[PDB]
Design a protein around this ligand. Structure first.
Ligand SMILES: O=C(Nc1c[nH]nc1-c1nc2ccccc2[nH]1)c1ccccc1
Length: 253
């Protein structure tokens, strides 16, 4: 439906082994968006083609304010292009480096926003699995938008729950572990299972070994603790996460 000659590529926005994302503008529309340029060579070489059309599948059909729109896609001889909604305020990754930590009000807001985001996806039987700050963009509102459904289902272990890492029966409850991981990271500055090696992170995760800096308020600990349970079943429902008192007590939105 679209070709490259419909667009004007602007500033580079990012990297990621399979290519770069460039800001761009639709010629005849003046519309602003992010073009994610991916090569056919690299996608076949690193055996992924299958995952991509599943991203497009999922992300094309999804509709939520806290989920990065995928408007479409296309390709040529050399490469495949994904036409993505553009998120003015960049990644939450960046804002965490810049700010080192977030506060309880900013974290809970994001948590809420992310909760609702994830609440919608499970509804369509979809599991993200890869909720990490590098994957979380920001809109004009300053609002959280979950990008990238590369590893979505109907590398860095840091965000994966004990079940996935150990190679087991995994359900939509993985995303609550992630949310716990995310919540701690926002607050603390780094993930609760961070290690220097893959192998050590594996054990840290596999044995749910985390601890709280002193500044983490009591209710933060509580919500994280309930979310970071080795056994899926003990994990709150998204409802309960939204319902949690430290959330509501602090969750602006
Ligand atoms: O595709 C990536 N990011 C984006 C999709 N839509 N909008 C963006 C975006 N990136 C930004 C960077 C700075 C400021 C605003 C931005 N909006 C992407 C791909 C690979 C690595 C990182 C981001």
């Amino acid at each position: 439906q679209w070709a490259l000659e419909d667009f004007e590529i602007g500033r580079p926005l990012g990297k990621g082994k399979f290519g770069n994302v460039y800001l761009a503008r639709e010629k005849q529309s003046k519309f602003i968006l992010a073009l994610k340029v991916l090569f056919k060579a690299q996608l076949e070489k690193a055996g992924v083609e299958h995952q991509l059309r599943r991203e497009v599948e999922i992300q094309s059909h999804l509709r939520h304010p806290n989920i990065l729109r995928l408007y479409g896609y296309f390709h040529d001889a050399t490469r495949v292009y994904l036409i993505l909604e553009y998120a003015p305020l960049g990644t939450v990754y960046r804002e965490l480096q810049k700010l080192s930590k977030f506060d309880e009000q900013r974290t809970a807001t994001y948590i809420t926003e992310l909760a609702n985001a994830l609440s919608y996806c499970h509804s369509k039987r979809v599991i993200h699995r890869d909720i990490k700050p590098e994957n979380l963009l920001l809109g004009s509102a300053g609002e959280l938008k979950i990008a990238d459904f590369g590893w979505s289902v109907h590398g860095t272990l840091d965000y994966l729950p004990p079940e996935m890492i150990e190679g087991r029966m995994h359900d939509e409850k993985v995303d609550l572990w992630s949310l716990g991981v995310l919540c701690y990271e926002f607050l603390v500055g780094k993930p609760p299972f961070e290690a220097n090696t893959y192998q050590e992170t594996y054990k840290r995760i596999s044995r749910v070994e985390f601890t709280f800096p002193d500044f983490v308020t009591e209710g933060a600990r509580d919500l994280i603790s309930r979310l970071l349970k080795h056994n899926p079943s003990q994990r709150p429902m998204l409802r309960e996460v939204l319902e949690h008192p430290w959330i509501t007590a602090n969750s602006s939105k």
